[PDB]
Amino acid sequence: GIPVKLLNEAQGHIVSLELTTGATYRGKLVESEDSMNVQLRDVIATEPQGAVTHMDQIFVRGSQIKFIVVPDLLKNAPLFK
Amino acid sequence: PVNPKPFLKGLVNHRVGVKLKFNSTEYRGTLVSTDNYFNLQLNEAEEFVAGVSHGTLGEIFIRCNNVLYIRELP
Amino acid sequence: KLVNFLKKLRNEQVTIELKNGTTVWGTLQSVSPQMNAILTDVKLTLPQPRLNKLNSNGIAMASLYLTGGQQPTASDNIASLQYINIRGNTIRQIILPDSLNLDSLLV
Amino acid sequence: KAMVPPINCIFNFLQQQTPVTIWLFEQIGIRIKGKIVGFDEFMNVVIDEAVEIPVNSADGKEDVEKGTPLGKILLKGDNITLITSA
Amino acid sequence: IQVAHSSRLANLIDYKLRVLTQDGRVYIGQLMAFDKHMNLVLNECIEERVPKTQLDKLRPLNIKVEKRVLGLTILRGEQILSTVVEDKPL
Amino acid sequence: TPELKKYMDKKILLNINGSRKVAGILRGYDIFLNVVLDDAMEINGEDPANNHQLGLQTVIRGNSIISLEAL
Amino acid sequence: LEELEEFEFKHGPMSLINDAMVTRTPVIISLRNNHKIIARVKAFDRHCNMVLENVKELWTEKKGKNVINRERFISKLFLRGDSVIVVLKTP
RNA sequence: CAUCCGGGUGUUGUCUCCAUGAAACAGGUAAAGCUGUCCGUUACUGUGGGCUUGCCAUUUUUUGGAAC
């Protein structure tokens, strides 16, 4: 359905994940899958308690993702037509 | 070697101990039957909570997702 | 089989009790093959001891407030909603009405 | 020098009869030592000479000295986090 | 707002929904899409949560909920408890 | 498949379930995100004194992997 | 193929649940929320979804140094199966 | 640079043939299928039609690591 297609359409934009562990990763979406497995690059990780750590890449298993925030300019991508 | 389904099919009519994921509860009893999903049925089974016997229960069914491990008993 | 039986409880006044303790009373308008349940004129409730045990039920009370239906500041946590759609995995039990002729539905 | 599939690594544990240590899924406080003797497509594993090893809360080391013998057990794959040699 | 009793999720596109998640938060936004897993796309999404400091007021009232403005947001279906309609389309 | 090809034969740090961390050379992977590690080490805190070498072969079950970071 | 599950329900572990249904004797079902249900099984499926009659639900609350044995009666109930831990035949 | 023999499309009128549950009355408009008004049907179930293409509990979603 459309939510996975929207995620694959976010590829190359900055997206922000929150995980089930509560952590937040903001970075450029490199790759995505029907599982919602995502790769991020050039990533700012916010620990749930507020700590901030920078990582060059992260791969996240899709089952551990809670929500993904994508850029708003995707609202009129062809997939919604 | 012995795979999980043949091993558990070989424990039928023997005593087994079914440790659970939760509450430190283990049921020890004679294995009656087993499903492909590893649902279990025990007769003469009895409950142990943290190693303390809670009396016999009789004939019980255990749903597959509650089981941690099934150990053979001597 | 049995969810295809739940498909027959339309327009009956079920009580769905969820796995977090939240109790949902209302008219059952539809049920998915996956037990996703759509209800109208819903009255969300939480048991009084659940509310007292704040540490173990803070999520449930927060969700009951954040549904937006908790208008009256009554002595019990109550939410009033015209429509709710419940994801079926979260349903623990469903009280059925006494008058229901189960023999005629389970065929 | 190739991709080694995880199932083939469990089969190497089985074939070379190498003792293993198993980290349980949410039970960070206990681990299981033994020898794998069979498995399936779900990583259910049959373990010979299983011993349940407590893990120290602060140090994080394995208290082998007070481990509990279990015998041949079928450890359900939904409860396995990690399998390692020795 | 009152909505038709026969309404399914397929009908609620462009409606503003409150979507409640299993960790105690709510997401409010216009529904753009849904999936067989109940994955949801919320446009212009806002998250509200009840801080633990203010949670005692809910025990047997004014609650100061914390908000984040998210924007276009994908919710993963397993995290969702239930969804409630807040507002009609424009 | 998990497209983990990028990570093969490189060091990775995996955050796994239970707030545990494991570092190792990715030896291979699976549709479920199961992975094999060479040279695996359990990570406890910052001090290397609390880190523990695991073994030659380590298999990690895919649902236990929360995340992995390239190193 | 339905003739397969017909057999797994007659000879596999769920045969116990089936005998409870056929002979109409009650069973004690332990739930994941620490509640016990003593009820008569009217119908079940492979998930251990159940439709039950004469449900008597028992659970114990904690109020500090003392506990209370709570109890309920439900005329008829649907139980989602994933909450089932152990189904025990009443002796 | 013209004439001539011809052509398309749109709108309105007219002519011929065939038809004629509601075509009454009033307003408005370039006009009307516009407004008041009138007629029929529909809301629940069954059958039928059309669409979706779902069915055709085992690690990434929905048959519970939860509960304390």
Residue E14 has φ and ψ, to the nearest 5°, of 65, -5
Quick check: B1 and D38 CB within 8 A?
yes
Quick check: F63 and A63 CB within 8 A?
yes
CATH architecture of B1-72: Roll (2.30)
* Residue F15 tokens, joined: 């955050």
Q: What amino acid occupies position G43?
A: A
* Residue E7 tokens, joined: 């309404």
Whether there are 3 or more C-beta pairs closer than 8 Å between D and G is no
Least Cα separation, residue G62 to chain B (angstroms): 17
Strand H nucleotides within a 7 Å radius of protein CB atoms: 44-45, 54-55, 57-68
Q: How many C-beta atoms lie closer than 10 Å to residue C2's C-beta?
A: 21
Quick check: C102 and G53 CB within 8 A?
yes
Q: Under a CB-based contact definition with an 8 Å cutoff, are residues D62 and D43 in contact?
A: no
> What residue has token string 């909505």?
E3
Nucleotide nearest to C11 (CA to C1'): H44
Full set of structural domains in chain E with CATH? 9-85 (2.30.30.100)
Class of domain G1-91: mainly beta
In 3D, which of F53, F55, F1, F8 has the Cα closest to residue F27? F8
Kindly provide the b/e burial profile for residues E64-77, where b requires at least 16 CB atoms within 10 angstroms of the residue's own CB: eeeeeebbbbbbbb
The DSSP letter of residue E78 is: G
B30 touches chain G (CB under 8 A): no
**Who's near A49: CB < 8 A, 6+ residues apart?**
none
From the CA of E17 to the C1' of H49: give the distance in Å: 35
User: Which residues of chain D lie closer than 8 angstroms to F42, CB-CB?
Assistant: 60
In 3D, which of B36, B18, B27 has the Cα closest to residue B54? B27
Least Cα separation, residue C96 to chain E (angstroms): 20
Q: Based on the number of CB atoms within 10 Å of its own CB, is A74 exposed (0-12), middle (13-18) or buried (19 or more)?
A: buried
User: Which residues of chain F lie closer than 8 angstroms to D60, CB-CB?
Assistant: 42, 44, 50, 52
> What residue has token string 């389309």?
E89
Quick check: E59 and C62 CB within 8 A?
no
Q: Under a CB-based contact definition with an 8 Å cutoff, are residues B18 and B70 in contact?
A: yes
DSSP, collapsed to helix, strand or coil, labels residue G29 as strand
Q: Under a CB-based contact definition with an 8 Å cutoff, are residues C35 and C91 in contact?
A: yes
Instruction: Give the span between the Cα atoms of B16 and B71, in whole angstroms.
Output: 6
Q: Under a CB-based contact definition with an 8 Å cutoff, are residues B15 and B70 in contact?
A: no
In 3D, which of C95, B45, A47, C3 has the Cα closest to residue G55? C95
Q: What amino acid occupies position F53?
A: Q
Quick check: G13 and B58 CB within 8 A?
no
Q: How many C-beta atoms lie closer than 10 Å to residue G30's C-beta?
A: 21
In 3D, which of A34, C15, A77 has the Cα closest to residue E32? A77
Q: Under a CB-based contact definition with an 8 Å cutoff, are residues B8 and B69 in contact?
A: no
From the CA of A11 to the C1' of H17: give the distance in Å: 68
DSSP, collapsed to helix, strand or coil, labels residue G7 as helix
CATH architecture of C1-107: Roll (2.30)
A15 touches chain E (CB under 8 A): no
Instruction: Give the span between the Cα atoms of G33 and G84, in whole angstroms.
Output: 10
Q: Under a CB-based contact definition with an 8 Å cutoff, are residues G29 and G17 in contact?
A: no
Read off the CATH number of the domain in which A7 is found. 2.30.30.100
Q: Using H for helix, E for strand and C for coil, what is the string for chain C? A: CHHHHHCCCCCCEEEEEECCCCEEEEEEEEECCCCCEEEEEEEEECCHHHHHCHHHHHHHHHHHHHCCCCCCCCCCCEEEEEEEEECHHHEEEEECCCCCCHHHHCC
- E46: nearest CA in chain A? A69
- F15: nearest CA in chain A? A60
Least Cα separation, residue D80 to chain B (angstroms): 10
From the CA of E57 to the C1' of H59: give the distance in Å: 41
In 3D, which of E27, E39, E20 has the Cα closest to residue E82? E20
Quick check: B68 and D72 CB within 8 A?
no
- B38: nearest CA in chain G? G13
* Residue F61 tokens, joined: 């079950």
List G56's β-bridge partners, or say none: G38, G73
Least Cα separation, residue A35 to chain F (angstroms): 9
Q: What amino acid occupies position C91?
A: I
Quick check: C66 and E59 CB within 8 A?
no
Q: Under a CB-based contact definition with an 8 Å cutoff, are residues C91 and C38 in contact?
A: no
Facing residue for G87 by CB, picked from B35, B60, B65:
B60
From the CA of G88 to the C1' of H66: give the distance in Å: 20
Q: Under a CB-based contact definition with an 8 Å cutoff, are residues G80 and C17 in contact?
A: no
A49 touches chain F (CB under 8 A): no
In 3D, which of E68, E64, E22, E3 has the Cα closest to residue E42? E68
Q: What is the Cα gyration radius of chain B?
A: 11
Instruction: Give the span between the Cα atoms of A1 and E83, in whole angstroms.
Output: 19
Strand runs labelled E in chain B: 15-20, 25-34, 40-49, 52-62, 67-72
* CA–CA distances in Å: residue G1 to residues F57, G15, G17: 42, 18, 21
In 3D, which of F19, F25, F26 has the Cα closest to residue F3? F26
Q: How many C-beta atoms lie closer than 10 Å to residue D27's C-beta?
A: 16
Angle, CA of A52, A56 and A62, to the nearest 5°: 85
Q: Under a CB-based contact definition with an 8 Å cutoff, are residues D4 and D16 in contact?
A: no
Give chains near E: 3+ CB pairs under 8 A. Answer: A, C
Contacts across the A-F interface (CB distance below 8 Å): 39
E86 touches chain C (CB under 8 A): yes
Domain that holds residue F15: 1-71
Read off the CATH number of the domain in which F12 is found. 2.30.30.100
Q: What is the DSSP string of A5-74?
A: HHHHHTTTSEEEEEETTS-EEEEEEEEE-TT--EEEEEEEEE-TTS-EEEEEEEEE-GGGEEEEE--GGG
Instruction: Give the span between the Cα atoms of E79 and E72, in whole angstroms.
Output: 17
The DSSP letter of residue E76 is: P
- H helices of E19-89, in order, are none
Residue A55 has φ and ψ, to the nearest 5°, of -130, 145
> What residue has token string 């925030």?
A69
Domains of chain B, by residue range, sit at 1-72
DSSP, collapsed to helix, strand or coil, labels residue G35 as coil
Angle, CA of D44, D46 and D48, to the nearest 5°: 155
> What residue has token string 């039990």?
C93
Domains of chain D, by residue range, sit at 3-85
**Who's near F11: CB < 8 A, 6+ residues apart?**
F23, F24, F25, F70, F71
Query: Dihedral through CA G11, CA G16, CA G17, CA G23, nearest 10?
Result: 110
Interface probe, candidates B19, B48, B61, B68, chain G, greatest G C-beta count within 10 A: B61
Kindly provide the b/e burial profile for residues F1-17, where b requires at least 16 CB atoms within 10 angstroms of the residue's own CB: ebebeebeeebbbbbbb
The span from the first CA to the last CA of chain F, in angstroms, equals 21
* Residue G48 tokens, joined: 């251990």
Least Cα separation, residue A37 to chain E (angstroms): 12
Which resolution, in Å, applies to this structure? 2.3
In 3D, which of C54, C24, C20, C53 has the Cα closest to residue C37? C24
Determine the CATH number of domain D3-85.
2.30.30.100
User: Which residues of chain C lie closer than 8 angstroms to E6, CB-CB?
Assistant: 29-30
Domain that holds residue A65: 1-79
Number of domains in chain F: 1
